[PDB]
From Swiss-Prot, chain A:
One GO molecular-function entry: collagen binding
Remarks, miscellaneous: Synapses usually contain asymmetric molecules of cholinesterase, with a collagen-like part disulfide-bonded to the catalytic part. A different, globular type of cholinesterase occurs on the outer surfaces of cell membranes, including those of erythrocytes.
Lineage: Eukaryota, Metazoa, Chordata, Craniata, Vertebrata
Quaternary data: Isoform H generates GPI-anchored dimers; disulfide linked. Isoform T generates multiple structures, ranging from monomers and dimers to collagen-tailed and hydrophobic-tailed forms, in which catalytic tetramers are associated with anchoring proteins that attach them to the basal lamina or to cell membranes. In the collagen-tailed forms, isoform T subunits are associated with a specific collagen, COLQ, which triggers the formation of isoform T tetramers, from monomers and dimers. Interacts with PRIMA1.
Family: Belongs to the type-B carboxylesterase/lipase family.
Name of this chain's protein: Acetylcholinesterase
EC number: 3.1.1.7
Tissues in which the protein is found: Predominates in most expressing tissues except erythrocytes where a glycophospholipid-attached form of ACHE predominates.
Organism: Mus musculus (Mouse)
């Protein structure tokens, strides 16, 4: 060993690690980046469940982020910070099953609450190495141990021929689970407490957290959960076994792969990764937004039944969850495929463009159901006002895909024994490069939770820095105790739990917490109670 | 003998009576026959004009009320008995009433013709709330009201038959309108300025005269209070009238059309009334057994079809609703509702109430109504459920049909003014939870609060004076705004763009936009698509 910072040498079950001392605003942190937690899922292991990483010899260098899992790279607005901040920032490879750990420097004396982040990206993209997921602030300021993992996305993570041995489905979820098992066995080496593990995630990451709540083998690996702008229930986070089969075999056809499952998957395994990515988007059943080709499948194994069935009959007595949404969940999706919408103008649309947007934003809906949506979201005082139509198209997509599934989830969890806290995040970052009409888009709370505004080189306002400190405190208080409130700080306004009776939730913005009742209650009765009865 | 009380009409001489109003005397000619008594072989038949009479006909008292069911839900209760017949029932009931200023006007005066409501099964022009003396005295109006046949006698139809063609009660009204053209000048009225006004079924009747060409030369303007020709209760198809007519005949022991109607004509009047209510196709409220029928004659098509394609360019209309249209209907058949308690109901009672209040609705459609009107913050709160039940019935039957009518008339060239009446009378005997019920604006428009023996407040007297002005200004000019008052807030016309209407209450006029717009989109655009 010899001459190295002794605070950076650590042993886990697979061997020795060397981390790096990083600078955060208030002082140093330790990071162990690029720790392998699985055998590289390459070759005959593509589409297969992950196997645990075999021990290595020598001191593994854990000072840089490892490869990003193979994925489609967004080129809608190339060169534009608003999109590129989500794009991969390391090399793409199928050899991507690595995780990251930040801890205080020096490492904590007594066992510390662990937070595990699961990124989103529609189950087709994402990486734990993106700047907005930087764990250094939470580790330095709140003393947290923060863990994030890469999991397979797209076909590599979710392509399924259900019932098969060679493509069983949900393997990306199994990568996540394996990283959680890794934290149970190994996080104490870093000063983390394996008995206090809080999962948090956004969008597909949040849906992922929800699937770990609903899947029994994952339940012993964590104690609390945070779902930001996503759920396992709802229209995009799962597919039936039949629909996944249909998408897998269509994709196979598109890349020249012909009849039994073994032979089809063996041929898919000979294809270059980039081939699979180039046809991934061509298997969706309609023109649509907020739909992704390869997502968790209701396999009868990882998911013993649909998420809707499991949240309706689950016993959630021992469970604390924090859930919420941003003010404008739907806005950004509109520029990825609704005619009339762009980031470079005000996107004022016509009534005709609104009806056409609804067919795309609600692709599974019949004619009757789409007229119901249109009639519900039309302002009948200004039925043709292009500003109102624009904002209504954003709300349709936001409510159908996020806000109403979250309200449904919170309601079922609460009624069935869970302690639930709910929020709406309404602060638009001063540094946002998306246009004003998009408001607070899907994903733009994350940089505040992780504490980026504390970095003075990023140019957030002082108020934003104080707001980020507040949120970091809510999230880590929740990780520590199951309650986002500070016990010592009595006079600060309280965040009451969500109940079916009172339906309380809080506004997260620059002003002190304000308590509201009813999470889009009238409109979510439309989506969650009425619309389903209009598919019978 | 007072020569202001002697008038010569086409059929002969009349003697009226000088009545006292608060501010001075008025002349009234009550009980003037405008048709041959529609009795015997004339039952179910179009009215024939009254034959001339000899001498001086005494027109100093109200005549008989048209034969009808008398309400016995709350016997001796003012709130119900004020709507019950106040003269003898008879099939011989085709008489009209005229109030005029005393002395009779020097120059020709705008004429207002009232058409009473009562679901096409009841009512009378003789009720105290239809007293024309206040409008006559204070505004100098000539006010006319007529009896028309109701129930089977007025609307029993075997469509296409010669002996029960349907809509005869509407033809009674039309004949009284013809009478006014030929005769009202003798009283100082202007036949060139005739405004129809009516409430509930009386309003739907006014609407049916708008939509029927032969009625259109008999008036110039119209007011429809809490009622429309479109909507779920004011018409039936020819097939459904035939069905109800032949069911009713079966219930009284009768018997082709000729034979069936001849046997019905032998039955005492009360036998017909006894079985009237048993022909409705479901358990329901705000539904009536014998109503105007889409005959292809008086009504050439459904009222929906006629308002959609009509040209209403030279028409001025005033329309509106009260704050709680559906409230009272609830105690006439929805389990859980009574006048004598607060009617706090359960969710289960709300779902059951909706099937009754929207009787034509499928399972899915009734679930949409329940889901729309539930407050999802307080889904089980009994106060919210009670008020929502009232709203369902009021919106489905009155408010939304009115918003649809106003919209179509405005889009198609009519000058339209709309209101919501929100003042609850201090003298109301119905309970607080019913709010401002269907019918309780009428006493204000007719000016009853000006009678100091009736114990309205001073504020109520001044409010009634304001309304009497709006209504008679409208009759005079087609515009309810006082052409003298150079201060605001003016009552603007209703249009499909702006959708402006006004609140009538003790406070000065307030202009609002959108008459239950979201909710009426539900009833008027979505539910039809749920066929
Ligand atoms: N080359 C093709 C061919 C066919 C289709 C393609 C692309 C696309 C397309 C997909 C991704 C990016 C651009 C275009 N689409 C559109 C997919 C539209 C749905 C995805 C929208 C989307 C895009 N991203 C990029 C990831 N970035 C983000 C995020 C998050 N937030 C934000 C906020 C603003 C901007 C981006 C962003 C938060 C979570 C993580 C990632 N995530 N989600 C198609 C759709 C069809 N129905 C059929 C075919 C095709
Ligand atoms: N004896 C029977 C037998 C069977 C049925 C009967 C009655 C009734 C019923 C009818 C009238 C009165 C009481 C009971 N109903 C109930 C019919 C519901 C429709 C009548 C509701 C109604 C009753 N009135 C009385 C006239 N009074 C008013 C009004 C107006 N406003 C008001 C305001 C408050 C109270 C009354 C009132 C304004 C305009 C004119 C008359 N108008 N409208 C049945 C229904 C069915 N589906 C089947 C069978 C039967
Ligand atoms: C904004 O830009 C898009 C795509 O370039 C275009 O289709 C749309 O019509 C524009 N909107 C307006 C009102 O300028
Ligand atoms: C932040 O502000 C500085 C100082 O003026 C500027 O030069 C820098 O480029 C900005 N950086 C970002 C992240 O926008």
């Amino acid at each position: 060993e010899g001459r190295e910072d002794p605070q950076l040498l650590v042993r886990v079950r697979g061997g020795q690690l060397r981390g790096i001392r990083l600078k955060a605003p208030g002082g140093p942190v330790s990071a162990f980046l690029g720790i392998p937690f699985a055998e590289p899922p390459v070759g005959s292991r593509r589409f297969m469940p992950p196997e645990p990483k075999r021990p290595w010899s020598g001191v593994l260098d854990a000072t840089t982020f490892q490869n990003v899992c193979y994925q489609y790279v967004d080129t809608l607005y190339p060169g534009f910070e608003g999109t590129e901040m989500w794009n991969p920032n390391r090399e793409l490879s199928e050899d991507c099953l690595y995780l990251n750990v930040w801890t205080p420097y020096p490492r904590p004396a007594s066992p510390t609450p662990v937070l595990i982040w699961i990124y989103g990206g529609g189950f087709y993209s994402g990486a734990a190495s993106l700047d907005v997921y930087d764990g250094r602030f939470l580790a330095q300021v709140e003393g947290a141990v923060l863990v994030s993992m890469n999991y397979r996305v797209g076909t590599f993570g979710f392509l399924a021929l259900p019932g098969s041995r060679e493509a069983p489905g949900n393997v990306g979820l199994l990568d996540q689970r394996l990283a959680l098992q890794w934290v149970q066995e190994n996080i104490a080496a870093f000063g983390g407490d394996p008995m206090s593990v809080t999962l948090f995630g956004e969008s597909a990451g949040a849906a992922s957290v929800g699937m770990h709540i609903l899947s029994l083998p994952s339940r012993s690996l964590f104690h609390r959960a945070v779902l930001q702008s996503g759920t396992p229930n709802g229209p995009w986070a799962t597919v039936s076994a039949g629909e996944a089969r249909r998408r897998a075999t269509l994709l196979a056809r598109l890349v020249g792969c012909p009849g039994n499952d073994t032979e089809l998957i063996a041929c898919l395994r000979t294809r270059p990764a980039q081939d699979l990515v180039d046809h991934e988007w061509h298997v969706l059943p309609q023109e649509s937004i907020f739909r992704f080709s390869f997502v968790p499948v209701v396999d009868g194994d990882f998911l013993s039944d649909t998420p809707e069935a499991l949240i309706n009959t689950g016993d959630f007595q021992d469970l604390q969850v924090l859930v919420g949404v941003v003010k404008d969940e739907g806005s950004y999706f509109l520029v990825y495929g609704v005619p009339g919408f762009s980031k470079d103008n005000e996107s004022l649309i016509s009534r005709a463009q609104f009806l056409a947007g609804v067919r795309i934003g609600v692709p599974q809906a019949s004619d009757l159901a789409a007229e119901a949506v249109v009639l519900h979201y039309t302002d009948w005082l200004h039925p043709e006002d292009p500003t109102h139509l624009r904002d209504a198209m954003s709300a349709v997509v936001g409510d159908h895909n996020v806000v109403c599934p979250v309200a449904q989830l919170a309601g079922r969890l609460a009624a069935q024994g869970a302690r639930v806290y709910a929020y709406i995040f309404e602060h638009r970052a001063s540094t946002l490069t998306w246009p004003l009409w998009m408001g607070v888009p899907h994903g733009y709370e994350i940089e505040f939770i992780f504490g980026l505004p504390l970095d003075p080189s990023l140019n957030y306002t002082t108020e934003e820095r104080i707001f980020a400190q507040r949120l970091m405190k809510y999230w880590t208080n929740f990780a520590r105790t199951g309650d986002p409130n500070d016990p010592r700080d009595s006079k600060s306004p309280q965040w009451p739990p969500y109940t079916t009776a009172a339906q309380q939730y809080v506004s997260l913005n620059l002003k002190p917490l304000e308590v509201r009742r009813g999470l889009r209650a009238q409109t979510c009765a439309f989506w969650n109670r009425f619309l389903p009865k209009l598919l019978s």
